[PDB]
Paper text:
Protein disulfide isomerase (PDI) is a major ER protein that operates as a molecular chaperone and a folding enzyme by catalyzing the formation, cleavage, and rearrangement of the disulfide bonds of unfolded or misfolded proteins. PDI consists of four tandem thioredoxin-like domains a, b, b′, and a′ plus a C-terminal extension, which are arranged into a U-shaped structure. Among the four domains, a and a′ possess a catalytic CXXC motif, which is not shared by b and b′. In particular, mutational and cross-linking analyses indicate that the b′ domain provides the principal peptide binding site in PDI16.
To determine the interaction mode of PDI with αSN, we carried out X-ray crystallographic analysis using the oxidized form of the PDI b′–a′ domains and the αSN peptide. We successfully crystallized their complex and determined the crystal structure at 1.60 Å resolution. The crystal belonged to space group P212121 with one b′–a′ molecule and one αSN peptide per asymmetric unit. Even though the two-domain arrangement was extensively affected by the crystal packing, the b′–a′ domains showed an open conformation in the oxidized state. Interestingly, the αSN undecapeptide adapts a β-hairpin structure in the crystal. Because a crystallographically neighboring molecule was accommodated in contact with the two domains, two different interaction modes were observed between the PDI b′–a′ domains and the αSN peptide. One interaction mode (termed contact-b′) was mediated through the b′ domain surface proximal to the a′ domain with a peptide-binding area of 391.6 Å2. In contact-b′, the αSN peptide was recognized through several hydrophobic interactions involving Leu38 and Val40 of αSN and Ile213, Tyr218, Met222, and Phe267 of PDI. Furthermore, the main-chain amide group of Leu38 makes a hydrogen bond with His270 Nδ1 atom. The extent of the interface area and the number of intermolecular interactions suggest that contact-b′, rather than contact-a′, primarily mediates the interaction.
Author numbering:
A (entry chain A): 208 to 449
B (entry chain B): 31 to 41
The structure:
Amino acid sequence: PLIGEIGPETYSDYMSAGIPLAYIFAETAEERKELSDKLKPIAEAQRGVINFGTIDAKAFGAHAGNLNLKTDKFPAFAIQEVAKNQKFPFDQEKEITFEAIKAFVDDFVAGKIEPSIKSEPIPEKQEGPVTVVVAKNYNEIVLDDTKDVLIEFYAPWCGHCKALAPKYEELGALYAKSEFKDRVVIAKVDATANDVPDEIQGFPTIKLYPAGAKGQPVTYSGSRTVEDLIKFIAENGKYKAA
Amino acid sequence: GKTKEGVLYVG
């Protein structure tokens, strides 16, 4: 059929087809059938341009994360550009109608949709001395030209990251009670759960984005002690802060 | 393939 079933057996063939895959996520076979029937004419119009399939959002709801979709909100629709490793999620707050999916797919084909940037949600509160960065607040926080921003790119599974974390919190606390508390940010970002503009080759990576020098961040290479990190901030930031 | 969490993968 034109709209097949995306699952562990058919995934490799969709990934080998060399064209995007549009996913129709729904939690029941009836809804999958309803949406497949509804959207068939769009799949037909796109034959050989974009493959369409349904995907069992009960069994494979987690797969929605691969498309920068929320893993808990169905039904859902997204296009994966397999060539380019780009993901184009349709807004899970909108109803999946013929007209809206047609307009979405038409916009995708027209080049009108920017690839989605993977991000955790904006943290609901920013209290505790270390600031949590996600892709959606990276520009506002890290590239804030009025603050020296120390940013740790880490993975939750990373042993050195785990070892660093208590020292990193001690560092945040020192700055938070310093006379530089409104111009130094001690921040971290889970680089496994957020796309960042930085090229990160290993974890942890620590960079200082100085006030007034955001295009020239300084990569830290010291001993990862609190004292060494204070020195690093003091030496490389605009505010010579400690 | 699928992971235990239900993520699909190739190969």
